[PDB]
Design a protein around this ligand. Structure first.
Ligand SMILES: CC(=O)SCCNC(=O)CCNC(=O)[C@H](O)C(C)(C)COP(=O)(O)OP(=O)(O)OC[C@H]1O[C@@H](n2cnc3c(N)ncnc32)[C@H](O)[C@@H]1OP(=O)(O)O
Ligand SMILES: CC(=O)SCCNC(=O)CCNC(=O)[C@H](O)C(C)(C)COP(=O)(O)OP(=O)(O)OC[C@H]1O[C@@H](n2cnc3c(N)ncnc32)[C@H](O)[C@@H]1OP(=O)(O)O
Lengths: 429, 429
């Protein structure tokens, strides 16, 4: 009988996984995984194997994987609009379930996400009264924290549900959240950049990306394609990155998914993290302000380094090679905007930056990360409001942290609560 | 020459500490601190020595310490109003500097915090338009995220300051934040519980606690005393607790102190964490609803356990004994409200709960934690709005996470970014 239902699929999947994690632990719970050194402690857990996160695993050389699926692989296997880029909808099914979805499954997340899109009056209100000097990420985060009055897990909890059923409310929570995100995001864009206009409504027949672009006001067909790849590739990046790990950390205290995602964005918003999106553009904007020589480009990079700032869009805590997210973007540019000056500028830096970083001898990974290439793609299409870029990153990331949130709760993952130490204490240990 | 200035003290303190952490590492950076097992990974880092945090160290048996200062010790050594409880101001000086302040230093944080108290118009606005079904923690968090437009570190960063000077803007950031907190908190209270009234203004001559109580509208002299202990003992609890660790985690990406503190509250807001404050009261409220026998009390506890819920206010991830925060509160009650029925009820549970928890055989620590005792103290004084309790916890916690934030940045602590793994991956490792 019947038809598509992530939830019913999930219901078959949880017990097996549980069981499977049970014996594993019964047999290796005591196996040492690694060691912890002083340096790791002082170094922000660098190199520490500390979290279990399932939806994605990052390889230091090869880069991110969604099952064991690489970006190029997803590109090939996930369903497309009709027509080149992969639907973030399909990634999502993939992240939750471990399996490649059928277009028919994919069409289901679309409707579903379309059905759930709705904003409460208080939230709209707040967004409309916010000042234009309030950063876009700030507005996004305060808005999602403010949606928690709508929480199905928050409500269920207060009613006293048995802990075995958490995963069920979380899932509603997450589907509703994802569903709402674009409305919230577009409302910010519109208030800040298209004053007096309106987001309009969601069209049950479109895919999530395409309703987002409409609400953002973009008509360019290829722009929609950009959005679909963008939202897909920004999805997830294992659980130790600030944004994901934050969501995991807060979600672990039983704060609802709205509250964990909003904390997550306060993290995405850090310069060292997602804000790099925006930071690259400004730096590029500054560069061009002060078609240059490789050498003048180089004087430029040293000046940043010498000033005790970072070069944005370069380096990575885990990656040891060029981010396949960066390559992916590059290949998109070569097909669609190969003659763009900004693009050409990004291709040029690629030949200098890492060399300069190797020169300085401090960065462990001198290659570009995803942030180095995303904004140029956007700017080309007419979306030149750079302080807004990170919101896009936010909307995508929801796909991964929320898919995992549902698993944490399904698996009964407990309170994230490590032991801390002081310098005196350590010195004495 | 001259007079009091935390900042000038801090300026003398940073280089020494830096230097001191330099050689330490040069000599032990490679020393293994511990090991990581599968179980620890699956278990939310339980038992993992993973963070360096300086302001406070929690001993599993003896409980929290601010330098190496115990709660009873602070009680004795910190300056008081004039007249029994310790000023959260003095704790703060203590947390930042490692030293016991003089009343004259303490009077300085008071004025300082009084000088900096001010709310921007947009923030006030948002608070006034929020719905009454929007949880108090929600409102607090969206409000602090929304204050980030005022960030001195956010502004400085965008201007390109050298990384050596971060600690300086953070400190302004933190002093301004602490300073504002009570205004924000009281404005929420007032809107939600005293509609039509106003917070009134801050009096440069009072201490931080006493201006808070006034803005909250409480006149009881002993209530002020309660507040002063409360805000002091809730200050900090090492860095691995959700709230603190969150702030550390987000702050590590360079998000300003407003954004890190607001993420921190999304964490405090979890039932498993600070919300326990509130959870205890409701549970107590439910209990009394359905002067009882030890036995009926016991049937009551089993019913919670059997229902797959937690008993609130009991248990702890690190503590192995009764929280000295709990004892501290208990001793306050015995002096001031020994005949209170709710209090008597809390004393009774103390004789049953742990026994029942020992019975069940799942909790590692069956003793009460701070959350088990705080609300009864408040309720007694007429502050019976339990969904509000966690805000108080929030305002206090700022004292510790912000004091450490200033050190992280002063010490050049990098990006918190551990390695995650999947079950498949682990299974294969
Ligand atoms: C998408 C994500 O948010 S991740 C990347 C987005 N962020 C950026 O593009 C910002 C620039 N990048 C950086 O700040 C870093 O490369 C990070 C945060 C991505 C990685 O951090 P870490 O693991 O601590 O890097 P790494 O181990 O290479 O640091 C060694 C030294 O090189 C420096 N370094 C690394 N990347 C850079 C860079 N892009 N510009 C200048 N110096 C750099 C580090 O700051 C550090 O200096 P320090 O020892 O005085 O603190
Ligand atoms: C102030 C702070 O926020 S910390 C405490 C505030 N929180 C509370 O009072 C909520 C009740 N407490 C709890 O949920 C826990 O005792 C915590 C979160 C404080 C500690 O968490 P953990 O380190 O994971 O606890 P512990 O190791 O004892 O857990 C072992 C088992 O006992 C259970 N247990 C522990 N405390 C309780 C309690 N208060 N009621 C019922 N069962 C409990 C745990 O949930 C777990 O069950 P599980 O294996 O099916 O998941």
């Amino acid at each position: 009988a019947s038809s598509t239902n992530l939830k019913d699929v999930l219901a078959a999947l949880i017990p097996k996984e549980q069981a499977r994690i049970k014996t594993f632990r019964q047999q290796h719970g005591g196996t040492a995984l690694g060691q912890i050194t002083v340096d790791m402690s002082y170094g922000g857990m660098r190199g520490m194997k500390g979290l279990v996160y399932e939806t994605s695993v990052l390889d230091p050389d090869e880069g991110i994987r969604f099952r064991g699926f690489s970006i190029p692989e997803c590109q090939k296997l996930l369903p497309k609009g009709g027509g080149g880029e992969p639907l973030p909808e399909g990634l999502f099914w993939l992240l939750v379930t471990g399996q490649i979805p059928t277009g028919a499954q994919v069409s289901w997340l679309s409707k579903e996400w379309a059905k759930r899109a709705a904003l409460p009056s208080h939230v709209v209100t707040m967004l409309d009264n916010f000042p234009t000097n309030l950063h876009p990420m700030s507005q996004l985060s305060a808005a999602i924290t403010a949606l928690n009055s709508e929480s199905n897990f928050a409500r269920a909890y207060a009613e006293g549900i048995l802990r075995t059923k958490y995963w069920e409310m979380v899932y509603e929570s997450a589907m509703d959240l994802i569903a709402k995100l674009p409305c919230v995001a577009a409302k910010i864009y519109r208030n800040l950049y298209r004053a007096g206009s309106s987001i309009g409504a969601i069209d049950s027949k479109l895919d999530w990306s395409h309703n987002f672009t409409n609400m953002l006001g973009y008509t360019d067909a290829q722009f929609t394609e950009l959005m679909r790849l963008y939202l897909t590739i920004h999805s997830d990046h294992e659980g130790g990155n600030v944004s994901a790990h934050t969501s995991h950390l807060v979600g672990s205290a039983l704060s609802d998914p709205y509250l964990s995602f909003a904390a997550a964005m306060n993290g995405l918003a850090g310069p060292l993290h997602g804000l790099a999106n925006q930071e690259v553009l400004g730096w590029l904007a500054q560069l061009q302000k002060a078609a240059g020589a490789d050498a003048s480009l180089r004087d430029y990079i040293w000046n940043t380094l010498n000033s005790g700032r970072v070069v944005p869009g370069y380096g990575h805590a885990v990656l040891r090679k060029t981010d396949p997210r960066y390559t992916c973007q590059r290949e998109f540019a070569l097909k669609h905007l190969p003659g763009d000056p900004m693009f050409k500028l990004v291709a040029q830096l690629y030949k200098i930056v890492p060399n300069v970083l190797l020169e300085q001898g401090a960065a462990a990974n001198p290659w570009p990360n995803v942030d180095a290439h995303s904004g140029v793609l956007l700017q080309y299409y007419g979306m030149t409001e750079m302080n807004y870029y990170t919101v896009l990153f936010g909307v995508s990331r929801a796909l991964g942290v929320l898919a995992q949130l549902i698993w944490s709760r399904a698996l009964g993952f407990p309170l994230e609560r490590p032991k801390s130490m002081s310098t005196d204490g350590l010195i004495a240990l």
